[PDB]
Design a protein around this ligand. Structure first.
Ligand code: NAI
Length: 387
């Protein structure tokens, strides 16, 4: 499926996230100069909005988005970032962006150069890259990530989102090479490179923090995710953060892996089993009153753990914001309903309507307060953007 991009709806999407953060009040003792790698959509965009509008932080964002021209709309992340900087410049904040491949050495060189000239040093480094592939910045070798289980193939009842049909599917296992590629793409090496390079150039302030986002889920998803190929990459993140945290010790800084809840993004809608899992989870958590989106998760992570008094930790040293999803009352009902979902009860036993709505929100469609019978103007420019 292709969904075009609605510029006006994307801006209203950014404004609504800004409104949520501002209503919750300032982030006490928060960061003032934040670098967000992957700052145009999803959790990274939420992190940039929480920093700028919760803490009054200057933000430098790195993303990879297609710009807009006459009669050809760019990607949603382009209009998201364009709207973010427009709102941020209003409040008096510094907001600049870099459009390029964050895995490359040149973007790191440009980011360091921009920080020196524009900010000096940064308070916090948010690492939220979601890429299906990575080109190694030293051997040009391209790695492509895979979402398969390890060991045994898995059967389950999926959901054809186009035909709106429950399908019997089978996911084959992953070879040792597919897992190695997935670790190269989604592991911690590039995050490790980022902090190293930022340390040599001395653009990390005293007590600087860095965090990378991850997902653990519960038992229903462990075969595909956590104990699959993608989980081996996130498992590599937990090994890398121990090294990162050490290099930040002479500064008095910290490095943490932050676990967030499952959310409809462009990167998770592709994962197997996710459309049906999200449709069920949305219904169970809505009737329970714990349904949360991107901005609620990251705003809470800033306030309670990243810069709070009593951080929500686990026994591995990770900051946690996903606890409501993993609760037995939520998980056990999702597991019970999964089998009883057929083509006829789709909208009655699941929140497939909510999943579809939130998926179209990513592109600027079905956003409250937007007039969708007006001509779309796709030529939106971003002042002082660096390519
Ligand atoms: N989406 C979810 O349900 C969950 C996501 N997470 C994690 O949070 C992180 C963020 O993912 P999402 O927000 O879901 O994805 P997303 O697709 O919404 O965000 C990806 C971001 O990274 C940027 N990006 C991608 N490839 C790039 C490249 N080569 N160079 C520069 N920028 C690049 C994109 O421009 C975008 O800003 C991921 O590590 C994901 O595993 C955490 C928990 C669950």
């Amino acid at each position: 499926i292709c969904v075009t991009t609605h510029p006006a709806g994307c801006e209203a999407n950014v404004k609504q996230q800004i409104d949520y953060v501002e209503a919750k009040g300032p982030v006490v003792n928060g960061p003032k100069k934040v670098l967000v790698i992957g700052s145009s959509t999803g959790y990274g965009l939420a992190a940039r909005i929480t920093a700028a509008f919760g803490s009054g932080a200057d933000t430098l964002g790195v993303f990879f988005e297609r710009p807009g021209s006459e009669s050809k709309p760019g990607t949603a992340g382009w209009y998201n970032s364009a709207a973010f900087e427009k709102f941020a410049h209003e409040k008096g904040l510094y907001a600049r962006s870099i459009n390029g491949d964050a895995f490359s050495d040149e973007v790191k060189r440009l980011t360091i150069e921009t920080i020196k000239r524009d900010l000096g040093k940064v308070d916090l480094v948010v690492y939220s890259l979601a890429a299906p592939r990575r080109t190694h910045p030293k051997t040009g070798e391209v790695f492509s990530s895979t979402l398969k289980p390890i060991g045994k193939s898995v059967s389950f009842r999926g959901l054809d989102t186009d035909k709106e049909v429950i399908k019997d599917v089978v996911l084959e296992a992953a070879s040792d090479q597919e897992v190695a590629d997935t670790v190269a793409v989604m592991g911690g090496e590039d995050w490790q490179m980022w902090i190293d390079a930022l340390l040599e150039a001395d653009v990390l302030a005293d007590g600087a923090k860095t965090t990378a986002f991850t997902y653990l889920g519960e038992k229903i998803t462990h075969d595909i995710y956590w104990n699959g190929s993608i989980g081996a990459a996130k498992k590599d993140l937990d090994q890398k953060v121990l090294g990162i945290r050490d290099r930040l010790a002479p500064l008095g800084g910290d490095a943490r892996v932050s676990v967030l809840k499952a959310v409809v993004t462009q990167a998770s809608s592709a994962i197997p089993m996710m459309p049906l899992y999200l449709s069920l989870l949305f219904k169970v958590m809505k009737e329970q009153g714990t349904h949360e989106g991107c901005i609620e998760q990251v705003d809470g992570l800033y306030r309670e753990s990243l810069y709070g008094a009593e951080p929500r930790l686990d026994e591995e040293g990770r900051l946690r914001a996903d606890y409501k999803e993993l609760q037995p009352e939520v998980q056990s009902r999702v597991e019970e309903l999964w089998d009883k979902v057929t083509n006829e009860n789709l909208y009655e036993l699941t929140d497939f309507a909510g999943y579809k709505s939130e998926f179209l929100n990513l592109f600027g469609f079905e956003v409250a307060g937007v007039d969708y019978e007006q001509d779309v103007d796709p030529d939106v420019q971003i002042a002082n953007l660096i390519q």
